[PDB]
Design brief:
The protein is α/β, with parallel strands linked by helices and 602 residues long. 31% of the residues lie in helices and 11% in strands. α1 crosses α14 and α6 runs antiparallel to α15. It binds a molecule of 6 linked components (NAG-NAG-MAN-MAN-NAG-FUC), a molecule of 4 linked components (NAG-NAG-BMA-FUC), the ligand OC[C@@H]1[C@@H](O)[C@H](O)[C@@H](O)c2nc(-c3ccccc3)cn21 and 2-acetamido-2-deoxy-beta-D-glucopyranose. A molecule of 6 linked components (NAG-NAG-MAN-MAN-NAG-FUC) binds next to loops.
Length: 602
Amino acid sequence: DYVLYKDATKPVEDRVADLLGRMTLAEKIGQMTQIERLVATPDVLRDNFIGSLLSGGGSVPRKGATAKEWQDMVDGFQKACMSTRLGIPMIYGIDAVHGQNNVYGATIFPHNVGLGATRDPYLVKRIGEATALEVRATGIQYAFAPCIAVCRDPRWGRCYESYSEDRRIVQSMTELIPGLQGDVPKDFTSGMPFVAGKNKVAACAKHFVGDGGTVDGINENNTIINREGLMNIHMPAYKNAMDKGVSTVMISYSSWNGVKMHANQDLVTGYLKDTLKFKGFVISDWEGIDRITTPAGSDYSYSVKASILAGLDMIMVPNKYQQFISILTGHVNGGVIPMSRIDDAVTRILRVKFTMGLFENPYADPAMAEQLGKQEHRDLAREAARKSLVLLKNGKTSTDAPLLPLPKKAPKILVAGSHADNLGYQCGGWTIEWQGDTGRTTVGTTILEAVKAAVDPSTVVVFAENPDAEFVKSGGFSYAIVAVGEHPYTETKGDNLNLTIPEPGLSTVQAVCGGVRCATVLISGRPVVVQPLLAASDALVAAWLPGSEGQGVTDALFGDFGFTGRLPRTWFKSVDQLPMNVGDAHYDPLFRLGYGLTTNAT
Ligand SMILES: *[C@@H]1O[C@H](CO)[C@@H](O[C@@H]2O[C@H](CO)[C@@H](O[C@H]3O[C@H](CO[C@H]4O[C@H](CO)[C@@H](O)[C@H](O)[C@@H]4O[C@@H]4O[C@H](CO)[C@@H](O)[C@H](O)[C@H]4NC(C)=O)[C@@H](O)[C@H](O)[C@@H]3O)[C@H](O)[C@H]2NC(C)=O)[C@H](O[C@@H]2O[C@@H](C)[C@@H](O)[C@@H](O)[C@@H]2O)[C@H]1NC(C)=O
Ligand SMILES: *[C@@H]1O[C@H](CO)[C@@H](O[C@@H]2O[C@H](CO)[C@@H](O[C@@H]3O[C@H](CO)[C@@H](O)[C@H](O)[C@@H]3O)[C@H](O)[C@H]2NC(C)=O)[C@H](O[C@@H]2O[C@@H](C)[C@@H](O)[C@@H](O)[C@@H]2O)[C@H]1NC(C)=O
Ligand SMILES: OC[C@@H]1[C@@H](O)[C@H](O)[C@@H](O)c2nc(-c3ccccc3)cn21
Ligand SMILES: *[C@@H]1O[C@H](CO)[C@@H](O)[C@H](O)[C@H]1NC(C)=O
């Protein structure tokens, strides 16, 4: 007879309610299982009724894969899930945190920190729209963004994924959501999930909650703060995400006052779902439930019980799915975990799938391939790159002639530094590889390239990654541009207690600037000890992690556009002041939030 859930002309809730009514137990749990593509197989996916797949940092089908290949891969997996008795389509998620950053040839936009310096939430909304197209260009329908953490201690290896330390800023920046998912209807209820169609993608606000408040900025650690401070600092943006209709929420690895977020039934269920009235689905993090115990995985049986009862709807296993499903099947068979729970988690996972119309467009659109790396997107990124640069210094002394903007016509000029011609570096973490990489890892334009493509044909550009004083003073240069800074990092692998850039860097800035007037470009995902650099430089620019369009940098350096960006974070004097944020008593910055020197165009 007539199968309601299959009829597209029917209401979302009606269809969810109808399908859930036909589901066994194995299928309901299947919908709650998300696994790495690495352990996925048509059989596995079909036999275990897998409801979702993902790709961790660098989990690509083939290094250098085209968009078609990706689509084919995803389509391969979907073909399998569609063959289940009920034919429930799977949702493929990936970390498209600053473009479809895992794909080769994908436009790599500035990381969050840099975007916050722009204060242009509309620019961010356009980035989300772009990223939507490029993630859909590869057949994927779910991006694990935006990360709306409010980094409070730059020693945290994930600070670059935080728009600001000022929640107000992080809120205005949730505009990425409507960009990735499309805008929500006038009526729209705050908390209901939403996605416009096959040209948009489901978004994920992460990581609930207080991931940017751990002690010392130790990744995944504990956040010791009172409910009020937690609610007015780290909680706010989420409220915004509810109104903008965010589709999902990933839970943080970090604990609050000693309690693992994955086990926090009060915040996850009581506050997020019950109070904020979140109707989309909640997903764990990579082995996030295993990390509830200590050691991790020491009692997976507890992790399922504790996490599922806490209120989580989907688990990112992402490898030992057989265990996860066996363990959960048991708990339900034992009455330990009530079916109402499973019913709820599935109800949410489904509601989101019908809403985005996954049941109507489960397969890719080869027409969408072209989107990947589209020039218009690169221009957009280029714009954001320029707008995110924050001028800290521009003249060794009050009386000096402003170094920037530099002339495009000069006899001979010098570009140097470790980050000068290193695409991987200017891109930073989460680029091609999980930890990011060094060198020409994708399609882009390094700073050097931009420069050679901006100066007058009669301007001799000489490159020297790390020259000595002697070389510079004898070069006959009119000026030099040195780029240095941090190296690509991601999560824990990036926590830093000394926060001083790697060498050589300062040695190079000092060697070059001591030989000729210089403009120093600092590549970093956060504020770092900068006095030494500022001291040796005539002008110094904080470019954070610009991404693939180096021209964004040179656009400012040569005055085609003037610096407008302003510090999204507080720049410290020494790392022992930390934590130190706007509003604190001992607030003794080296550069307050909002600081940013400027210049004018043409
Ligand atoms: C401040 O604290 C930081 C972390 O808390 C320190 O950085 C970390 O230092 C350890 C060594 O103590 C280092 O060791 C691990 O990585 C080794 C290889 O490191 C290179 O490759 C990785 C990626 O593969 C990069 O992330 C590293 O940044 C590093 O990159 C190379 O750096 C060279 C010099 O800067 C450069 O010539 C290369 O081109 C560049 N190569 C690439 C591909 O980028 C590995 O052998 C070892 O077994 C460990 O696994 C960590 O890698 C390093 N940082 C990170 C993010 O992991 C920091 O130490 C200082 O700075 C470092 C960059 C390094 O030069 C140290 O020798 C130096 O003491 C601390 N700074 C201070 C002043 O104390
Ligand atoms: C020369 O460069 C200065 C750089 O500040 C320009 O003035 C600044 O223009 C901003 C708008 O572009 C002013 O408004 C706000 O700026 C922030 C930047 O953080 C924007 O994000 C925000 O949306 C606002 O628009 C800013 O206040 C202003 N700075 C000062 C000290 O007034 C200047 O622009 C020209 O003068 C200013 C006063 C405005 O009237 C501009 O509209 C006007 O074009 C630049 N000159 C030129 C020709 O562009
Ligand atoms: O890439 C998927 C998610 C990402 O969206 C989350 O923000 C982040 O917490 C995260 N850590 C790992 C991860 C960490 C260690 C080993 C293997 C994987 C994986 N992930
Ligand atoms: C925090 O980090 C410390 C040191 O790495 C570790 O001993 C402790 O168990 C962690 N605690 C939490 C709550 O993450």
